[PDB]
Write a protein that binds this ligand. Structure first.
Ligand SMILES: O=C(O)c1cccc2cc[nH]c12
Length: 69
């Protein structure tokens, strides 16, 4: 309907991403693989960046954009 729920939808993407990044096997995959996965789930580059900072493994915004280019 008329309510897009943009904020809660963005929050769910980032929290799902944080949970992905913390998975035991996912942690032992390269940053590029993780970035590509999150992009395929509809995260923006900023949201990917935010998720990496939240798991204590900050990546610069430019690093994310380079992987996705
Ligand atoms: O998206 C996840 O939370 C997730 C968790 C554990 C393994 C995989 C593999 C792709 N995605 C995963």
């Amino acid at each position: 309907g008329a309510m897009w729920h943009t904020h809660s939808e963005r929050e769910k993407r980032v929290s799902n991403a944080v949970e992905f990044l913390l998975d035991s096997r996912v942690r032992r995959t390269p940053t590029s693989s993780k970035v590509h996965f999150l992009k395929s789930k509809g995260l923006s580059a900023e949201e990917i960046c935010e998720a990496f900072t939240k798991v204590g493994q900050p990546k610069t915004l430019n690093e994310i954009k380079r992987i996705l280019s």
